[PDB]
Amino acid sequence: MPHAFKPGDLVFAKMKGYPHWPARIDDIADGAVKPPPNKYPIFFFGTHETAFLGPKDLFPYDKSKDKYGKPNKRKGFNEGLWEIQNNPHASYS
């Protein structure tokens, strides 16, 4: 059965006005800004941006890739697809 989300989990993450996007749940570094309550730090592959999102916008990668893991025109998307498939746990700073 499913657990709660934890750092390292891979997802497609949904934000208004964008396609479901390859992403991961990030750790929060020591001394770094924490997300609001009930939100997770989401790192978007390809763009390398962070946003704070709740579970309603988080789709587990394995279950969802057949639907959401196809190339898209949007800036950073296809790079994102490579990263999530090939090195999802790397440092992208």
Short mmCIF file of N, CA, C and O in Angstrom, two decimals:
data_model
loop_
_atom_site.label_atom_id
_atom_site.label_comp_id
_atom_site.label_asym_id
_atom_site.label_seq_id
_atom_site.Cartn_x
_atom_site.Cartn_y
_atom_site.Cartn_z
N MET A 1 0.85 -1.22 0.00
CA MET A 1 0.00 0.00 0.00
C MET A 1 0.88 1.25 0.00
O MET A 1 2.02 1.21 0.44
N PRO A 2 0.38 2.38 -0.57
CA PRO A 2 1.08 3.67 -0.56
C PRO A 2 1.47 4.25 0.81
O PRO A 2 0.73 4.11 1.78
N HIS A 3 2.64 4.91 0.87
CA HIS A 3 3.03 5.65 2.06
C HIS A 3 2.78 7.13 1.76
O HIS A 3 2.39 7.47 0.64
N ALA A 4 3.01 8.02 2.73
CA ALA A 4 3.07 9.44 2.44
C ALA A 4 4.26 9.73 1.53
O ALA A 4 5.19 8.93 1.41
N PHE A 5 4.21 10.88 0.85
CA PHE A 5 5.35 11.34 0.06
C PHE A 5 6.58 11.54 0.94
O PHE A 5 6.46 11.98 2.10
N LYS A 6 7.77 11.22 0.38
CA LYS A 6 9.03 11.47 1.08
C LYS A 6 10.07 11.98 0.09
O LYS A 6 9.94 11.79 -1.11
N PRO A 7 11.12 12.68 0.57
CA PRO A 7 12.18 13.22 -0.29
C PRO A 7 12.72 12.08 -1.15
O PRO A 7 12.92 10.96 -0.65
N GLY A 8 12.91 12.34 -2.44
CA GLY A 8 13.45 11.33 -3.33
C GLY A 8 12.37 10.69 -4.21
O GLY A 8 12.65 10.16 -5.30
N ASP A 9 11.11 10.75 -3.75
CA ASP A 9 10.02 10.24 -4.57
C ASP A 9 9.94 10.95 -5.92
O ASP A 9 10.01 12.16 -6.01
N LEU A 10 9.70 10.18 -6.99
CA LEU A 10 9.59 10.77 -8.32
C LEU A 10 8.12 10.89 -8.71
O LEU A 10 7.34 9.93 -8.49
N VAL A 11 7.78 11.99 -9.39
CA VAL A 11 6.38 12.30 -9.72
C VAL A 11 6.28 13.00 -11.08
O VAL A 11 7.26 13.49 -11.66
N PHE A 12 5.03 13.12 -11.57
CA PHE A 12 4.71 14.25 -12.42
C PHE A 12 3.96 15.23 -11.54
O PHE A 12 3.03 14.80 -10.85
N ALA A 13 4.34 16.53 -11.61
CA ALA A 13 3.74 17.55 -10.76
C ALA A 13 2.94 18.53 -11.63
O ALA A 13 3.41 18.94 -12.70
N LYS A 14 1.73 18.88 -11.17
CA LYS A 14 0.80 19.65 -11.99
C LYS A 14 0.72 21.06 -11.42
O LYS A 14 0.42 21.24 -10.24
N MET A 15 1.00 22.03 -12.30
CA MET A 15 0.79 23.43 -11.97
C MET A 15 -0.11 24.05 -13.03
O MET A 15 -0.08 23.62 -14.17
N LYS A 16 -0.90 25.03 -12.60
CA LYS A 16 -1.83 25.76 -13.45
C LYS A 16 -1.13 26.21 -14.72
O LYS A 16 -0.08 26.83 -14.65
N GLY A 17 -1.72 25.87 -15.87
CA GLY A 17 -1.21 26.41 -17.12
C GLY A 17 0.00 25.64 -17.62
O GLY A 17 0.60 26.02 -18.61
N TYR A 18 0.35 24.52 -16.95
CA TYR A 18 1.44 23.75 -17.49
C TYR A 18 1.04 22.29 -17.57
O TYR A 18 0.22 21.83 -16.78
N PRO A 19 1.67 21.50 -18.47
CA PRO A 19 1.41 20.06 -18.55
C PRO A 19 1.98 19.43 -17.28
O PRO A 19 2.87 20.02 -16.69
N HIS A 20 1.45 18.27 -16.88
CA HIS A 20 2.02 17.42 -15.84
C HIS A 20 3.53 17.26 -16.08
O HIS A 20 3.94 16.81 -17.16
N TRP A 21 4.36 17.59 -15.08
CA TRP A 21 5.77 17.85 -15.39
C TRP A 21 6.68 16.90 -14.60
O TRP A 21 6.48 16.73 -13.42
N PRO A 22 7.72 16.27 -15.21
CA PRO A 22 8.61 15.38 -14.44
C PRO A 22 9.28 16.15 -13.30
O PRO A 22 9.82 17.25 -13.49
N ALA A 23 9.23 15.59 -12.09
CA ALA A 23 9.68 16.28 -10.89
C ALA A 23 10.06 15.28 -9.80
O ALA A 23 9.83 14.08 -9.90
N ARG A 24 10.65 15.81 -8.72
CA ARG A 24 10.90 14.96 -7.58
C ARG A 24 10.55 15.73 -6.32
O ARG A 24 10.47 16.96 -6.36
N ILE A 25 10.35 14.99 -5.22
CA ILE A 25 10.23 15.61 -3.90
C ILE A 25 11.64 15.89 -3.41
O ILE A 25 12.42 14.96 -3.33
N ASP A 26 11.97 17.15 -3.15
CA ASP A 26 13.31 17.49 -2.70
C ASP A 26 13.44 17.37 -1.18
O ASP A 26 12.44 17.37 -0.46
N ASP A 27 14.69 17.20 -0.72
CA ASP A 27 15.03 17.44 0.67
C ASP A 27 15.02 18.95 0.92
O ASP A 27 15.05 19.75 -0.01
N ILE A 28 14.97 19.36 2.19
CA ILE A 28 15.23 20.76 2.52
C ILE A 28 16.62 20.80 3.15
O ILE A 28 16.86 20.03 4.08
N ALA A 29 17.54 21.61 2.61
CA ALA A 29 18.89 21.69 3.15
C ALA A 29 18.85 22.33 4.55
O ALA A 29 17.96 23.12 4.88
N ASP A 30 19.81 21.94 5.39
CA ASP A 30 20.02 22.62 6.66
C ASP A 30 20.08 24.13 6.42
O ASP A 30 20.81 24.59 5.55
N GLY A 31 19.28 24.88 7.17
CA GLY A 31 19.29 26.33 7.18
C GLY A 31 18.51 26.94 6.01
O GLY A 31 18.49 28.16 5.86
N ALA A 32 17.89 26.08 5.19
CA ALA A 32 17.17 26.55 4.01
C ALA A 32 15.69 26.79 4.35
O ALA A 32 15.15 26.32 5.36
N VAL A 33 15.02 27.55 3.47
CA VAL A 33 13.61 27.89 3.66
C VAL A 33 12.73 26.65 3.55
O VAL A 33 12.84 25.88 2.60
N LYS A 34 11.84 26.48 4.53
CA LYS A 34 10.91 25.36 4.61
C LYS A 34 9.64 25.67 3.83
O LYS A 34 9.27 26.83 3.67
N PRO A 35 8.90 24.64 3.35
CA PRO A 35 7.64 24.88 2.64
C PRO A 35 6.57 25.23 3.66
O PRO A 35 6.69 24.89 4.83
N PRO A 36 5.44 25.83 3.24
CA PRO A 36 4.27 25.95 4.12
C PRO A 36 3.87 24.57 4.64
O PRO A 36 4.26 23.56 4.03
N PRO A 37 3.09 24.51 5.75
CA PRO A 37 2.48 23.26 6.21
C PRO A 37 1.69 22.55 5.11
O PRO A 37 1.04 23.20 4.29
N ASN A 38 1.81 21.23 5.07
CA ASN A 38 1.08 20.40 4.14
C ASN A 38 1.60 20.55 2.71
O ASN A 38 1.02 19.94 1.81
N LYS A 39 2.66 21.35 2.48
CA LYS A 39 3.24 21.41 1.13
C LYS A 39 4.59 20.69 1.11
O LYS A 39 5.23 20.54 2.16
N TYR A 40 5.01 20.28 -0.09
CA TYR A 40 6.31 19.65 -0.30
C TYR A 40 7.15 20.52 -1.21
O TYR A 40 6.61 21.18 -2.10
N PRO A 41 8.50 20.51 -1.09
CA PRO A 41 9.33 21.20 -2.07
C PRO A 41 9.42 20.33 -3.31
O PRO A 41 9.87 19.19 -3.23
N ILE A 42 8.95 20.85 -4.45
CA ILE A 42 9.00 20.08 -5.68
C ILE A 42 10.12 20.64 -6.56
O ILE A 42 10.11 21.83 -6.92
N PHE A 43 11.02 19.75 -6.99
CA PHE A 43 12.03 20.16 -7.94
C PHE A 43 11.63 19.66 -9.32
O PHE A 43 11.46 18.46 -9.52
N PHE A 44 11.49 20.59 -10.28
CA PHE A 44 11.02 20.27 -11.63
C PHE A 44 12.27 20.00 -12.44
O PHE A 44 13.16 20.87 -12.51
N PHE A 45 12.34 18.79 -13.03
CA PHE A 45 13.45 18.46 -13.91
C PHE A 45 13.38 19.34 -15.17
O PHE A 45 12.32 19.82 -15.57
N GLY A 46 14.55 19.55 -15.78
CA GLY A 46 14.63 20.31 -17.02
C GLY A 46 14.69 21.81 -16.74
O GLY A 46 15.69 22.44 -17.04
N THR A 47 13.65 22.38 -16.11
CA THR A 47 13.72 23.79 -15.74
C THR A 47 14.58 24.00 -14.50
O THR A 47 15.13 25.08 -14.30
N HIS A 48 14.63 22.97 -13.64
CA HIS A 48 15.36 23.04 -12.39
C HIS A 48 14.75 24.08 -11.44
O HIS A 48 15.45 24.60 -10.58
N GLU A 49 13.45 24.37 -11.58
CA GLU A 49 12.79 25.29 -10.65
C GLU A 49 12.19 24.52 -9.48
O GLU A 49 12.02 23.30 -9.58
N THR A 50 11.97 25.22 -8.35
CA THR A 50 11.28 24.65 -7.19
C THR A 50 9.95 25.37 -7.00
O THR A 50 9.89 26.60 -7.10
N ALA A 51 8.90 24.61 -6.69
CA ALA A 51 7.66 25.19 -6.21
C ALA A 51 7.17 24.33 -5.05
O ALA A 51 7.63 23.20 -4.87
N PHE A 52 6.20 24.86 -4.30
CA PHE A 52 5.61 24.17 -3.17
C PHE A 52 4.22 23.68 -3.55
O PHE A 52 3.39 24.45 -4.03
N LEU A 53 4.00 22.37 -3.39
CA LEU A 53 2.76 21.78 -3.86
C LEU A 53 2.27 20.77 -2.84
O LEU A 53 3.08 20.16 -2.12
N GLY A 54 0.95 20.57 -2.82
CA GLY A 54 0.36 19.53 -1.99
C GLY A 54 0.09 18.27 -2.82
O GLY A 54 0.17 18.31 -4.07
N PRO A 55 -0.20 17.13 -2.16
CA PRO A 55 -0.45 15.86 -2.84
C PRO A 55 -1.47 15.85 -3.97
O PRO A 55 -1.38 15.01 -4.85
N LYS A 56 -2.45 16.77 -3.95
CA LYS A 56 -3.45 16.77 -5.01
C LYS A 56 -2.81 16.98 -6.38
O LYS A 56 -3.36 16.58 -7.41
N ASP A 57 -1.64 17.63 -6.41
CA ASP A 57 -0.98 17.96 -7.66
C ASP A 57 0.21 17.03 -7.94
O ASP A 57 1.01 17.32 -8.83
N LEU A 58 0.31 15.92 -7.20
CA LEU A 58 1.48 15.05 -7.30
C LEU A 58 1.06 13.65 -7.76
O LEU A 58 0.35 12.96 -7.05
N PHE A 59 1.52 13.23 -8.95
CA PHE A 59 1.18 11.90 -9.48
C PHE A 59 2.42 11.01 -9.52
O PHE A 59 3.40 11.35 -10.17
N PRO A 60 2.43 9.88 -8.80
CA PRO A 60 3.62 9.01 -8.81
C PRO A 60 4.08 8.60 -10.21
O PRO A 60 3.29 8.30 -11.11
N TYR A 61 5.40 8.65 -10.40
CA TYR A 61 6.00 8.58 -11.72
C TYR A 61 5.72 7.22 -12.37
O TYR A 61 5.34 7.20 -13.53
N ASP A 62 5.90 6.13 -11.61
CA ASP A 62 5.78 4.80 -12.21
C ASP A 62 4.37 4.60 -12.77
O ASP A 62 4.21 4.27 -13.95
N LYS A 63 3.35 4.90 -11.94
CA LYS A 63 1.95 4.78 -12.36
C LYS A 63 1.61 5.67 -13.56
O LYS A 63 0.79 5.27 -14.38
N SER A 64 2.20 6.88 -13.67
CA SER A 64 1.72 7.94 -14.56
C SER A 64 2.54 8.11 -15.85
O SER A 64 2.17 8.94 -16.70
N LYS A 65 3.69 7.43 -15.97
CA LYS A 65 4.59 7.79 -17.06
C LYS A 65 4.02 7.49 -18.44
O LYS A 65 4.29 8.22 -19.40
N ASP A 66 3.19 6.43 -18.53
CA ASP A 66 2.60 6.04 -19.80
C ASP A 66 1.66 7.14 -20.31
O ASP A 66 1.50 7.33 -21.51
N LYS A 67 1.08 7.91 -19.38
CA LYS A 67 0.17 8.98 -19.75
C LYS A 67 0.91 10.28 -19.99
O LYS A 67 0.56 11.03 -20.91
N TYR A 68 1.89 10.59 -19.14
CA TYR A 68 2.38 11.96 -19.04
C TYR A 68 3.82 12.08 -19.56
O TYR A 68 4.31 13.19 -19.73
N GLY A 69 4.47 10.95 -19.81
CA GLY A 69 5.89 10.98 -20.15
C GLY A 69 6.11 10.92 -21.67
O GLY A 69 6.78 10.04 -22.16
N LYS A 70 5.56 11.89 -22.39
CA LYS A 70 5.76 12.00 -23.82
C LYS A 70 6.34 13.38 -24.09
O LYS A 70 6.18 14.28 -23.28
N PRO A 71 7.07 13.60 -25.20
CA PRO A 71 7.66 14.92 -25.44
C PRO A 71 6.61 16.01 -25.54
O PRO A 71 5.50 15.76 -25.99
N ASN A 72 7.01 17.22 -25.15
CA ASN A 72 6.18 18.40 -25.09
C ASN A 72 7.03 19.56 -25.59
O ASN A 72 8.26 19.54 -25.45
N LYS A 73 6.37 20.56 -26.17
CA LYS A 73 7.01 21.71 -26.78
C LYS A 73 7.66 22.61 -25.74
O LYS A 73 8.62 23.31 -26.05
N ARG A 74 7.16 22.57 -24.49
CA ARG A 74 7.46 23.59 -23.50
C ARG A 74 8.93 23.55 -23.09
O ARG A 74 9.53 22.47 -23.01
N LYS A 75 9.48 24.74 -22.79
CA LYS A 75 10.89 24.92 -22.48
C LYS A 75 11.27 24.02 -21.30
O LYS A 75 10.74 24.17 -20.20
N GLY A 76 12.22 23.11 -21.53
CA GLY A 76 12.83 22.37 -20.45
C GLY A 76 12.22 20.97 -20.30
O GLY A 76 12.81 20.11 -19.66
N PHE A 77 11.07 20.76 -20.94
CA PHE A 77 10.29 19.56 -20.72
C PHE A 77 11.04 18.29 -21.11
O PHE A 77 11.08 17.31 -20.37
N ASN A 78 11.58 18.25 -22.33
CA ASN A 78 12.21 17.04 -22.84
C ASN A 78 13.54 16.78 -22.11
O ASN A 78 13.90 15.61 -21.90
N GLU A 79 14.24 17.85 -21.72
CA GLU A 79 15.40 17.70 -20.85
C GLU A 79 14.91 17.05 -19.55
O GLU A 79 15.54 16.12 -19.04
N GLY A 80 13.77 17.53 -19.04
CA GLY A 80 13.19 16.97 -17.82
C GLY A 80 12.91 15.46 -17.93
O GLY A 80 13.10 14.69 -16.97
N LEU A 81 12.42 15.05 -19.10
CA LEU A 81 12.12 13.64 -19.31
C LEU A 81 13.42 12.83 -19.24
O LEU A 81 13.41 11.73 -18.68
N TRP A 82 14.52 13.38 -19.80
CA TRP A 82 15.77 12.63 -19.77
C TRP A 82 16.23 12.47 -18.32
O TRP A 82 16.66 11.41 -17.90
N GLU A 83 16.13 13.56 -17.54
CA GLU A 83 16.68 13.56 -16.20
C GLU A 83 15.92 12.57 -15.32
O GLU A 83 16.52 11.81 -14.56
N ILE A 84 14.59 12.57 -15.41
CA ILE A 84 13.81 11.74 -14.51
C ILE A 84 14.07 10.25 -14.80
O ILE A 84 14.03 9.41 -13.89
N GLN A 85 14.36 9.95 -16.08
CA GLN A 85 14.52 8.56 -16.50
C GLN A 85 15.96 8.11 -16.22
O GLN A 85 16.15 6.95 -15.82
N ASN A 86 16.94 9.03 -16.41
CA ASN A 86 18.35 8.67 -16.46
C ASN A 86 19.19 9.04 -15.23
O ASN A 86 20.13 8.29 -14.92
N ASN A 87 18.91 10.16 -14.54
CA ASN A 87 19.63 10.49 -13.32
C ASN A 87 18.73 11.32 -12.39
O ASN A 87 19.00 12.49 -12.10
N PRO A 88 17.61 10.74 -11.89
CA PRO A 88 16.63 11.51 -11.14
C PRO A 88 17.14 11.97 -9.77
O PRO A 88 16.55 12.86 -9.18
N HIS A 89 18.22 11.36 -9.25
CA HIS A 89 18.67 11.66 -7.90
C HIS A 89 19.95 12.51 -7.89
O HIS A 89 20.49 12.77 -6.81
N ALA A 90 20.36 13.03 -9.06
CA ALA A 90 21.60 13.80 -9.16
C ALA A 90 21.42 15.21 -8.60
O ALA A 90 20.31 15.71 -8.45
N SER A 91 22.56 15.84 -8.32
CA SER A 91 22.60 17.26 -8.02
C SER A 91 22.46 18.06 -9.32
O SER A 91 23.24 17.89 -10.26
N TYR A 92 21.46 18.96 -9.37
CA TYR A 92 21.25 19.76 -10.56
C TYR A 92 21.45 21.25 -10.25
O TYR A 92 21.11 22.10 -11.07
N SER A 93 22.00 21.56 -9.07
CA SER A 93 22.51 22.90 -8.79
C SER A 93 23.64 23.22 -9.79
O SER A 93 24.71 22.58 -9.67
#
